[PDB]
Amino acid sequence: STAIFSDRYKGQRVLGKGSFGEVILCKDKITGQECAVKVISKRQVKQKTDKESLLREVQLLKQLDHPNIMKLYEFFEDKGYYYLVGEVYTGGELFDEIISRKRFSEVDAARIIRQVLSGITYMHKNKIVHRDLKPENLLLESKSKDANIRIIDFGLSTHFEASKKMKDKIGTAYYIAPEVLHGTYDEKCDVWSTGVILYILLSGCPPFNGANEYDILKKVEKGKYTFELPQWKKVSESAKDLIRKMLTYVPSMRISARDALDHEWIQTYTKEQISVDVPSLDNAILNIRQFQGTQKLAQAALLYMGSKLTSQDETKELTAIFHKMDKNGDGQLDRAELIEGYKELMKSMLDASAVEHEVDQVLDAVDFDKNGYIEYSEFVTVAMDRKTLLSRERLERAFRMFDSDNSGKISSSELATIFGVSDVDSETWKNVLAEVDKNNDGEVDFDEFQQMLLKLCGN
Ligand SMILES: CCOc1ccc2cc(-c3nn(CC4CCNCC4)c4ncnc(N)c34)ccc2c1
């Protein structure tokens, strides 16, 4: 009697979108235990290994326990997806916590990096490689200041092929080890990624950077970086030494995770008491806030355009479904039929229970209610506006957050940075601007930026 995910869990709400698919907050129908479930769509994500190999990894992952590694509880598979059920953590991404601080020192960075290396060391002893380690994969257990770090997605890269969509690979290029690019890699790739993360914590700038994905990769593959930024003068020699050892090009010469834990710098700056010399890295924290805001705005822009393309698709599809269901030809439908077509559209709505409630939120939202005969046309408008909300609202939020001086505007230099990170061709976005505002003087407000994005997705 093979078990069934939706027999055991109900979806509560969406937690986010991660590598390989959506993460949904779920609840055990008997025990009330809340859990974070990564749902991998077999249609969007191709497998690299065979079933046998994936089930063996899962079985191993369930038996490992470390304070800095996300705990996996359960694994299910049906016809259309894979479901990975883990512990839910509520502290958010590390860097989003870091940028809320007004003080940040080498002690804070060593506390951070020690946890990461401790989790990586443990996983490498069990022959699991992350490969895709980056800031987004570092979650905080809770919103508390003293919260432990939990690494997510350890081992998935081995069995599933990563999205080639830019909206999914923003800020992947900065962290990947050069041997991963060339195809022969081992567990040392996780030390390199960690090394990049440490460089960023102490300087707030990526060691390997450029205007677009491909320029960043060209820098990584060459392997050259420097410590000539002014804010490195404030950093201990010990920290730089550890960095050089983590960023060693040839993997066989690069320090192991385990050895990195024992390095003088980690031993010195994680002793809770001794502040022998501990200034605050003010420039770094502000660089990280700029870095983070840029990454988040580019991401939000791509998802805005993606949501706008989805809403074109689904509006037309839903209308054609309702049209054919309308046997009267009067343009009206009852509740069950609305539910039926919306389910037919299907392919957060993990069971029939999820669908009926979304429909009910819209029928309530249909302003005032006459029961029996519903104008299919207007239900479509409202169902779809609902779907785009999260993404337009999020777009404005990200715009406001990027605009740190509250100027209401972003410069064309800033647009170049954002569009380079979003991988929108240079000639393409300026042609678009020229058409939105024929009189602009090198800056756009929120509405203009939004109008630009619409034009860049064929509207
Ligand atoms: C081999 C383990 O297989 C699993 C199984 C379930 C997983 C669930 C989560 C998860 N994702 N998110 C949403 C975050 C929003 C911010 N961007 C990053 C994602 C989460 N938010 C809260 N808790 C979570 N657990 C997640 C991530 C990785 C998992 C890996």
Describe the protein.
It catalyses: L-seryl-[protein] + ATP = O-phospho-L-seryl-[protein] + ADP + H(+); L-threonyl-[protein] + ATP = O-phospho-L-threonyl-[protein] + ADP + H(+). Belongs to the protein kinase superfamily. Ser/Thr protein kinase family. CDPK subfamily. One of its GO terms (cellular component) is organelle. The protein is of the alpha+beta class. It has helices spanning 5-8, 51-61, 94-98, 106-125, 166-169, 178-182, 189-203, 213-222, 237-246, 257-261, 264-269, 282-325, 335-345, 352-365, 376-402, 412-422, 426-436, 446-456; strands spanning 9-18, 21-28, 34-41, 72-77, 81-86, 138-140, 149-151, 332-333, 374-375, 409-411, 443-445. It folds into 3 domains: 1-90 and 154-161, Phosphorylase Kinase, domain 1 (2-Layer Sandwich), CATH 3.30.200; 91-153 and 162-290, Transferase(Phosphotransferase) domain 1 (Transferase(Phosphotransferase), domain 1, Orthogonal Bundle); 291-459, no CATH class. The chain is built from 18 helices and 11 strands. The chain has a 5-stranded antiparallel β-sheet with strand order 1-2-3-5-4. A two-stranded antiparallel ribbon has the order 6-7. Helix 13 packs across helix 14 and helix 14 (352-365) crosses helix 15. The relative contact order is 0.09. The protein binds the ligand CCOc1ccc2cc(-c3nn(CC4CCNCC4)c4ncnc(N)c34)ccc2c1. The site of the ligand CCOc1ccc2cc(-c3nn(CC4CCNCC4)c4ncnc(N)c34)ccc2c1 has 19 residues, from strand 1, strand 3 and strand 5.
